[PDB]
Design a protein around this ligand. Structure first.
Ligand code: 12O
Length: 285
C-alpha cells in the first residue's frame, strides 16, 4: 500500500498540496496540506515518515526561503514542525543514509550553498558535515551503496554537468565523471544500481533527455527520452519504475506523470496530477 507522495510545488504561487498516487489503482488521494506553502523543496522518507525539506514560499504578500523541516505521519494525516536547518535552502537536494537526512546545497537569496547538513530523527538535530566541492542549487541527489551523489544544479555562475560523491564514513567529497548534458533541476533517483538524471535545464532549453550513470563503468549513458521536456520535475522510484511528476517545460506547468520501464527502455504517461505544478518534492512510503 506504498504511495507516491507529492508535497508542495508551484503554480502562480508556491503550493501547499500534499497528495498521493496509487500506481496500482490509478487513484489520487488529497491529504493534509502543508502548514506553510513551499516550492523547490525536497521530499524523502525515514521510518514510515515523510519529510518536506527546505524550499520557498513565493507568495503575493512576499517571498521567503525555507530552512524548515516538517514531518508528516500518514498514520495521523498530520504535519509536525521539526528542528529547522542551519541555513535556508531553496532548490535543495536531499538523500537518506542510515535513516539520516542529508540536506544538500540549495540557495538563500543568491547565497548558493555548497554546505551539507545531516538530520538525525531520534534526536531531532542537524549537524554540518563536510561541504561539497561545488556550490549547488537545482541539484539532484541519489543515494547508492551508502554513498551520496550530488548531481548538477547551478553554482551561482554556470549551470552544472558535473557530479560529486560523498563518502559518509570518511566525511569526504570526490568528483565523479560529468554528465552528457548540463542539468539544473533534473530529476535524480537510483534504479537497478544506476543513477538516473532525468530532464532538467541546460542553459538554452528545457530537457526531455535522460542519462544513467553506471557507477562501475564511470560512464553516463543516454536512455529513452521523456515525452515531455521538463524541469523542476518530481522524481521517484516505485516498484522498479521511475516516476517523473509535473514540472516546468518553458511555457506551462505540467500535470503529466510519465513512467519509465527500464526493461522495455520506454516511458508512457500513466496519470495526471490534479493541477499542473513545478518544483515539488516526492517520496514513496
Ligand atoms: O524558487 C524560485 O526561485 C522560483 C520562484 C518562481 C517560480 C518557482 C521557483 C522556480 O524557479 N523553480 C521551481 C523550483 C525549482 C527546483 C529546481 C530547479 C528549478 C526550479 C525552478 C523551475 N522554474 C523556473 O526556473 C521558472 C521561471 C519562471 C516561471 C516558472 C519557473 C519554474 O518553475
Amino acid at each position: 500500500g506504498r504511495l507516491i507522495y507529492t508535497a508542495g510545488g508551484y503554480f502562480r504561487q508556491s503550493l501547499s498540496y500534499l497528495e498521493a498516487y496509487n500506481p496500482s489503482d490509478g487513484t489520487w488521494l488529497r491529504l493534509a496540506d502543508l502548514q506553510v506553502p513551499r516550492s523547490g523543496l525536497a521530499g524523502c522518507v525515514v521510518g514510515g515518515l515523510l519529510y518536506a525539506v527546505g524550499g520557498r514560499n513565493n507568495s503575493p504578500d512576499g517571498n521567503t526561503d525555507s530552512s524548515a523541516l516538517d514531518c508528516y505521519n500518514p498514520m495521523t494525516n498530520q504535519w509536525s514542525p521539526c528542528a529547522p536547518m542551519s541555513v535556508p535552502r531553496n532548490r535543495i537536494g536531499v538523500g537518506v543514509i542510515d535513516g539520516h537526512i542529508y540536506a544538500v546545497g540549495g540557495s538563500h537569496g543568491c547565497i548558493h550553498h555548497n554546505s551539507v547538513e545531516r538530520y538525525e530523527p531520534e534526536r531531532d538535530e542537524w549537524h554540518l558535515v563536510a561541504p561539497m566541492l561545488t556550490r549547488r542549487i537545482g541539484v539532484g541527489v541519489a543515494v547508492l551503496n551508502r554513498l551520496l551523489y550530488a548531481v548538477g544544479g547551478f553554482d551561482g555562475t554556470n549551470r552544472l554537468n558535473s557530479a560529486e560523491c560523498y563518502y559518509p564514513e570518511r566525511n569526504e567529497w570526490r568528483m565523479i565523471t560529468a554528465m552528457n548534458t548540463i542539468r539544473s533541476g533534473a530529476g535524480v533517483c537510483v534504479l537497478h544500481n544506476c543513477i538516473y538524471a532525468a530532464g532538467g535545464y541546460d542553459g538554452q532549453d528545457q530537457l526531455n533527455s535522460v542519462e544513467r550513470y553506471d557507477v562501475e563503468t564511470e560512464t553516463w549513458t543516454f536512455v529513452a527520452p521523456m515525452k515531455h521536456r521538463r524541469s523542476a520535475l518530481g522524481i521517484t522510484v516505485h516498484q522498479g519504475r521511475i516516476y517523473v511528476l509535473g514540472g516546468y517545460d518553458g511555457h506551462t506547468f505540467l500535470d503529466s506523470v510519465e513512467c519509465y520501464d527500464p526493461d522495455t527502455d520506454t516511458w508512457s504517461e500513466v496519470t495526471r496530477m490534479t493541477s499542473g505544478r513545478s518544483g515539488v518534492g516526492v517520496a514513496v512510503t
